[PDB]
């Protein structure tokens, strides 16, 4: 229910500033934060329904009507012409112009050489190499710039769990560096707002919130979507957490990489600390700059991997097409490259009953148990739902029966997906145990935990997975070469027979019934050799109409027939025609087996 | 010789400022620009070998010893304590701290609300869709931020040639937007310096340069590698070019994307214009924000293309495996997706003599001429040197004989690479004529019209092509599979009793590979319960030693034998048939299989 909270419509503001909701039609204040009455000259009752022009004057930029796409005006100087000296501090206002509403949020300008001072840090990360190095540079650098008691770089993992990869802190305190946080700690709804809004600040934990006096819009009958307002009141859940933790102030800048939330810059202050718009802007700069390189390094990295994976993939491809017989020594030369292409610990090549195991892989029968378990009609749902290749990260989770084997086949890639059998490929990564230094929750009591996760292999790279799909052509290549080898066998075997054999291709009624294959035993009985006989119609008068009719009836209706008939010599030669229909998937007779001794 | 100039060690400075080389060992000035003597107070002779501290009055930040990685201090306030009112304008100094040397460059503070003023422009590009929109936004925006007469975004192509993709200029002066420049215009070493040093400016073209008085280091014996120093003197080659062009001032910010020089922000002023420390810093900001967004959009874009090409690729894959017969109507449903996966204008599927041409492709016999031309032993070098698939951008260049056809097959992707025949795939792009609006070396532009070339084959489209090689082997497998199941059914339905014997080795036995029902019945036990059985099992344990020896000798030496022997009977009926074992030919000549015919 907590992971289902609205958070964007609390109907409350952070007291450090004022919020006003203005009807763009008449330019009158429809809703207002309780803090508005004090900053602005006039108390609540009269301030409500009053035009914005009457109570606040701003010289830099003014609001305006928006058509569809909402527009946002940055923080600019705002004055309060309705009171006998109301500036205990300088004030700055930002706008959120919507087609139905205007949202103005104001806060103290504050002050105190910043953007120029940040420049050498930005330049140093941009030229820096490696998420690690940059993350730690940003951590230390931002700790010097904005001055927080804690600056940590929180990286989101694949399942949206966090990890503190970098940290800069006061000499004192206990380092949270290396700590893992669940996905549940930062809900989807919250995460979305960090993308939409780049920098957010909790100025003082346990603030007395300022409610938006007319809770719902007086004419629209809806609450105020504070999704873009920085003054948006935080979840009490999270506030209690921070309070229990001893942290009183918070600055969180979003590390958005390729328009996706890669991670966060988390800043904690164990005393209260409002970070002014100008400073917020600098942290946003460093966040974007950090966000920039990581993506840069991510791009370069990927690029290099693609190239080498391709080189190896193409060798495997050419080497496989080049050899005409799948020898044990061929596969033993193949295996290293075939494991490398998918960065597997071991690979097992299946070819109908036979298994050619290589690298760090389970026993021949254990492998067979895995293939057998996959090929099953119970796990038929998995194979279809699988992209080009079936792959597991923790064998125990998807194949519960197979829960063991995990020390050597913790993860695997299986190709082909079809229960196609005969040829297959099983890539495997052995179990690699993860030591995950978690973090606690319920002010000076703390005991760390350390989950040791067995059964899981190193996660399958999406790039390694496409490298696997890219090698499907070795399976069809194996299969083609196999049938080609088996065919040339039976073709030689039938040609060396004594009992005169020919395969008759059923003409599609239009075309005649013709000779597909004919042996050296059979052609000889006719005289004319095999080459000249392939393609001639079965109709090769003298022959009795009664006998021909029986044979023709079989050809007509796709049935069998045993009939003695004369032939064409180079004695007239009378052999017994044993025409038999060869089975078809359609059930429609497509070919016939003709033999005669 | 020009494309191999040093440029990093000219031994000269831009007169607008002063450069000093300091020995970090005892803080003395070892080398100095001729301009140093005028602003520092003390003339050259005495200024040389003197400690920097005597002429130091820098309060903001000071130099320091470094270990390995050089460090750079930003432009900060510096004063000359040897002269009574030394300047007319404030002076600012930057440091380049190396483990062997310290490089201090100073220049007028100038000034003339800048970094906050730039923030909405950075904001505007960070949100922009597509490179084209961001490039033009940066161009216009930087032209407003600094009053340059010209601001152009120069994009490097695959061959390191440039293209002005964006431009913001004065109402007057002819637009260079759309102009193409050769790779020769910006040499490799020049390009390298734009990567190492992101921002570069020329204050006034045809400046009287300030030489570094002690040309080489007095103790190390090497010249001064400016490389990071903005005051560095640019090539006279390039200066003459700018002068001929009428431009007097420069400002070039590097668009480095994924650690590679993607392009440049070129700024021209037709009058002299020094851009201050605060100034350069803002352009640096916009350059990387622009570089940032370009790479971001590049990433996102690629990501989305990969996903849809995969979906389509997987449909082709499953749809091809699903059908058991390659009908004309199947291929006609396949063709659209099969062309789409590689963004081809037309595709032609070959299957032994037959051709199923689709989309905008040449005539059936013209296609055949292309395949024939590729499959040739003369172009055998091309095929091996290719990656997974053979591909051309301009058919006329690689296959000169095929120079025509270019209107419909200007470019193509051929697969399989092997002269494997029987099954193939020919993707084709028709000729798309390029109008390249070149630039004229010293007002006069040209317009190359390049015919014979198709749109360049995307590396992403090429890997999408390689990814579909499995359709060729799938076609072929299904074909041999069909031909095999034919002969396998034909032999199984025979009367004379036949079995195929697979020869073994030292540890391996001679086993039955294939056995028909006629053969199985004579033994009693069915076909399933016979495949893989050892040949020895079939004859009785009673069998005469004389007869078995003959058969074994054939198996031993891969020869033939015709011997009557009893059969292993479960019941007890003495079944004696003639074993007609014959060796089936092998390419090696070494008997690999035998044909076992059983007739009385
Ligand atoms: C209902 C689920 C939640 C549990 C359990 C919990 O502890 N918090 C829950 C909800 C929310 N968390 C929100 C923000 C948030 N959480 C973290 C977590 C950490 N920050 C750290 O620095 C560390 C450890 C060092 C942890 C584990 C962060 C960083 C943030 C962002 C703000 C901040 O702390 O800097 C959140 C959004 C609040 C809001 O704006 O309404 C919710 C709902
Ligand atoms: C030696 C061969 C060269 C020929 C021919 C030529 O035209 N230039 C040659 C050499 C160098 N060019 C260098 C720098 C440089 N080149 C450009 C290119 C252009 N600028 C433009 O505005 C346009 C078109 C509108 C083009 C094609 C620029 C911009 C620059 C940097 C200076 C500037 O901002 O104008 C160069 C390096 C010189 C240096 O810095 O030492 C060399 C050797």
UniProtKB/Swiss-Prot annotation, chain A:
One of its GO terms (molecular function) is photoreceptor activity. The keyword Flavoprotein does not apply. Residues 311-479 are annotated as: Phytochrome-specific (PHY). Residues 2-107, 486-558 form the PAS domain. The keyword Transcription regulation does not apply. Residues 486-597 are annotated as: PAS9, output module, not required to bind biliverdin IX-alpha, required for dimerization. Induction: Expressed in dark and light (at protein level). Part of the bphO-bphP operon. It comes from the Bacteria. Forms head-to-head homodimers. X.campestris pv. campestris colonizes plant leaves and is responsible for black rot in cruciferous plants (Brassicaceae). In the cruciferous model host organism A.thaliana, morning and midday infections result in more hypersensitive responses than evening or night infections, suggesting light plays a role in virulence. Photoreceptor which exists in two forms that are reversibly interconvertible by light: far-red light (733 nm) converts protein to the red-absorbing (Pr) form, while red light (630 nm) partly converts the protein to the far-red-absorbing (Pfr) form. Regulates virulence of X.campestris pv. campestris on its host plants, perhaps by fine-tuning expression to ambient light levels and/or spatial cues. The Pr form may sense light and partially inhibit virulence; in the dark (Pfr form) biofilm and xanathan production rise and bacteria are more virulent. In the N-terminal section; belongs to the phytochrome family. This is Bacteriophytochrome. It comes from Xanthomonas campestris pv. campestris (strain 8004).
